[model samples]
Target: MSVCKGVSGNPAKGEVFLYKHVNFQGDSWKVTGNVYDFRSVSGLNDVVSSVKVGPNTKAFIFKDDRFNGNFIRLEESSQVTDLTTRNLNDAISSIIVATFESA
Candidate 1:
């Protein structure tokens, strides 16, 4: 099984959406829900303001500001373990979900 999956988005300035059934790790999938801001708004500049995972709905929720792009990229690193990174720019908004499965 693959241990990594890609996520892409083109959200508005202050729009929130839900990404369901996101495979974070083998048998440990998570759903990303809640508000996602792709725009460079106050208090949310080039960074994730908040994140919530599991309990609520086995999901990870994150928010960012000022991302006016078309796509996003995500990668999984062995050392990081279950860590997610987001590329916020004007061309893409990608993220990598780390999974327990092998590459």
Candidate 2:
């Protein structure tokens, strides 16, 4: 099973899970808000292969550091089990949780 190792407690409204392999496999990081550089988290830069977003949350994934280069916006509650189809496999460096439907 794929567990969110980067964060504790249950998944929150604005959280997003970044996976190192397709199908939500391998190492993972649960993030919220904006991450200008994946390097802040070891072994996560330029190697994201999939993602799982929390309910009412949208994610903007970037291909380069500091929110530069190519990017893709994943809709709320999107579960991109495979990013190869989106041409972003192993090429993600930053992420932003654009919207979070607060309670």
Candidate 3:
């Protein structure tokens, strides 16, 4: 799992976050939210997902039998900008993702 804080641009106004291919085909999971359209650092319109307003936390939970990967990333929308500008060609190779077994 990935966790990030204060990556939103306007903390006072609140920022919208977009996730793509979240529920890709062949993946078994349920996703529900109140989404909004926002401009990403990629200079493209993205769909931001959010929960209802109140004392709460947003989470993305998944369950599967087989998977591959070491770490999950929680990135600021602007981070994509920096990544693109540098033309980095290397795959990310840091951080460890947490895994939990289903009850």
Candidate 4:
């Protein structure tokens, strides 16, 4: 069985995880708040397959740097299989965690 690599300790409020594939696939990283350089992370740039959000953590993915352009919002536990349909796919460059609302 494979073990989860990212997320060492209890992440701060609004922690989110990005996967290599949809439905929580591939390697993952626990990211808190916003990230400007998605390429800096190992195999994270434009390869986001899925997303996982914690309580009160709603994630938004952007196609440009520093969230300056278009984006897709992934609510808590959004098991996205592919971002291509949303026109993001491997073009994603930024991400951030936003406030959570009761669904």
> Each model's TM-score, in the order given?
0.24, 0.70, 0.16, 0.65
For candidate 3, write residues 1-103 as lDDT tens digits. Answer: 2223222322111222323222211211112232112222232122222211111222221111113322222322221212222222112112211222344
| lDDT assessment of candidate 1 | 0.26
Task: Enumerate residue pairs that collide in model 4.
Answer: 21-49, 22-81
Which candidate leads the pack in TM-score?
2
Candidate 3 lDDT: 0.22
Candidate 1: worst-modelled 10 consecutive residues by lDDT: 52-61
On the 0 to 100 scale, the lDDT of residue 96 in model 3 is: 19
The TM-score, computed over Cα atoms with residue i paired to residue i, of candidate 1 is: 0.24
Which is the better candidate, 2 or 4, if ranked by lDDT? 2
True-structure RMSD, every candidate: 14.0, 5.0, 13.7, 5.8
Writing each residue's lDDT as its tens digit, candidate 1 over 1-103 gives 1211223342222222223212322222122323234233332223331222222122222223224333332222111131244433221122323222344
lDDT of 1 at 73: 23
Query: lDDT of each structure?
Result: 0.26, 0.68, 0.22, 0.63
Rank ordering of all candidates by lDDT, starting from the highest: 2, 4, 1, 3
- 3 or 4, which is superior by lDDT? 4
RMSD of 2: 5.0
Task: Write the number of the candidate with greater lDDT, choosing between 1 and 2.
Answer: 2
Q: Which segments of candidate 1 are over 4 A away from where they belong?
A: 1-33, 60-103
